[PDB]
Design a protein around this ligand. Structure first.
Ligand code: HEM
Ligand SMILES: NCCc1c[nH]c2ccc(O)cc12
Length: 453
């Protein structure tokens, strides 16, 4: 029945120059504000359409009709994350095999085994802030990223990146960041010899990542040690379907994937949650009151983290306004009609624009830009597929429980131990890589002088 709107075009380049910008997701959100719930986005060689309403995304989330697509962004990241969970297609044998093997390591129950390692890193964060001098401040996303990288290293392969001991990045990290950057940069360009150097550097970075991870795996098998880490489960697990274990090359890709998937996504969430708390002091007060009520011991237990309900609402309200992995891609499994109005062909692509979904006034009411964690008080009232910050169905985030347990523990501890001051009246500036984060967000903390165990 209807023709899809489309944003402004640039002759032969179609819509491509619209993503030639430091902040493409935020540019796409303004397009959606103008064009509405669905728009066609064309590039040379390719077309996708971006969805922004709960009414159409609830249909895109029908797994009988649509499966996960590798967006052009993920295709580029697949050049180094290979067939790990995030960059594999659903129909590749290593997807279902690794998904079956790793699901038991990522459940709510499994979080009891990672809890003590998470605490070890959260205590390092608290001690860093306790030890600042009166005149100093905190570089919020920088310190969040030290906690989240350390927590994934320790829980994922018993490796200490010791990020609180340094300001220079780990070699793996240098190459990872630079490969992510190149993958991001390729979205925009239009094979010229001007890129011979980008190409050589990318190859060099892929080799550094593979060499360093292949050695962690070799070391582990050579030593025989059993930890409560992901690497142990991968080396010992068998997929109950095929009966097969993962091989070493696939294990290497799962480890690279954990670092690409489970680190800056969670540090972004912690940084946005802090930003909203300091911009909303009544919400900060209510969250700090819960942390004081619940965290009655020198360090938090697993069960006490589960009891930080309001802190959990705070994190979901940050994920509502700024989901840190802001889009995911799908393809039509068969010809079908979306919303009774937009016929799609088998293989056609869709993009779910999560921050715009989360602004659907028909779901959230008119106060959609307000930070109000109490929206999440009776979650059964939320319609299906309205709130999707960890994606969809069997291709949802396998790390969801991990990220929320880490973020709830850390933000609980921060709220127990410090008062916070937005001393610069910081203006939100969201920096975009594949993921979102507040850039330049700084605060001052004033210790409540409560001892740690
Ligand atoms: C607040 C933090 C996080 C957010 C918002 C988040 C978001 C998401 C989203 C939106 C997807 C689906 C992407 C797609 O459909 O293309 C996804 C997939 C995934 N995430 Fe996360 N994630 C976070 C934390 C983590 C953590 C901590 C880990 C690992 C420890 C992780 C590991 C993965 C993996 C491996 C997948 C692919 C799962 C599969 O397809 O089988 N994530 N994530
Ligand atoms: N698991 C949250 C990270 C995440 C989801 N989708 C992604 C796509 C590319 C990327 O580098 C990272 C991601």
């Amino acid at each position: 029945i209807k023709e899809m709107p489309q944003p402004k075009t640039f002759g032969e380049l179609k819509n491509l120059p619209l993503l030639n910008t430091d902040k493409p997701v935020q540019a796409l959100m303004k397009i959606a504000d103008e064009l509405g719930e669905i728009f066609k986005f064309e590039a040379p060689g390719r077309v996708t359409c971006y969805l922004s309403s709960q009414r159409l995304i609830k249909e895109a989330c029908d797994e009988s009709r649509f499966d996960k697509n590798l967006s052009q962004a993920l295709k580029f990241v697949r050049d180094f994350a290979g067939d790990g969970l995030l960059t594999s297609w659903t129909h590749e044998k290593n997807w279902k095999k690794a998904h079956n093997i790793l699901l038991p390591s990522f459940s709510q129950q499994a979080m009891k085994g990672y809890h003590a390692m998470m605490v070890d890193i959260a205590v390092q964060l608290v001690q860093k802030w306790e030890r600042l001098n009166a005149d100093e401040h905190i570089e919020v996303p920088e310190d969040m990223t030290r906690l989240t990288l350390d927590t994934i290293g320790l829980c994922g392969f018993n490796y200490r990146f010791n990020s609180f001991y340094r300001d220079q990045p780990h070699p793996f990290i240098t190459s990872m960041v630079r490969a992510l950057d190149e993958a991001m940069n390729k979205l925009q360009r239009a094979d010229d010899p001007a890129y011979d150097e980008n190409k050589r550097q990318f190859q060099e970075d892929i080799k550094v990542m593979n060499d360093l991870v292949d050695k962690i795996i070799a070391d582990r098998k050579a030593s025989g040690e059993q930890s409560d880490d992901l690497l142990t489960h991968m080396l010992n697990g068998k997929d109950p379907e095929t009966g097969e274990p993962l091989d070493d090359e696939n294990i290497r890709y799962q480890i690279i994937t954990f670092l690409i998937a489970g680190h800056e996504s969670t540090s972004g969430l912690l940084s946005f949650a802090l930003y909203f708390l300091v911009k909303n002091p009544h919400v900060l007060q209510k969250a700090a009151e819960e942390a004081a009520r619940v965290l009655v011991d020198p360090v938090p237990s697993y069960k006490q983290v589960k009891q930080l309900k309001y802190v959990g609402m705070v994190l979901n309200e940050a994920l509502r306004l700024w989901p840190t992995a802001p889009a995911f891609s799908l393809y039509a499994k068969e010809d079908t009609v979306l919303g009774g109005e937009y016929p799609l062909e088998k293989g056609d692509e869709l993009m779910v624009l999560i921050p715009q979904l989360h602004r659907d006034k028909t779901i959230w009411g008119d106060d959609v830009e307000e930070f109000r964690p109490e929206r999440f008080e009776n979650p059964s009232a939320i319609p299906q597929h309205a709130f999707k910050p960890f994606g969809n169905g069997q291709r949802a985030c396998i790390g969801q429980q991990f990220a929320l347990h880490e973020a709830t523990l850390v933000l609980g501890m921060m709220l127990k131990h410090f008062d916070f001051e937005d001393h610069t009246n910081y203006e939100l500036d969201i920096k975009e890589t594949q993921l979102l984060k507040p850039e330049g967000f700084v605060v001052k903390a004033k210790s409540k002088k409560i001892p740690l165990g």
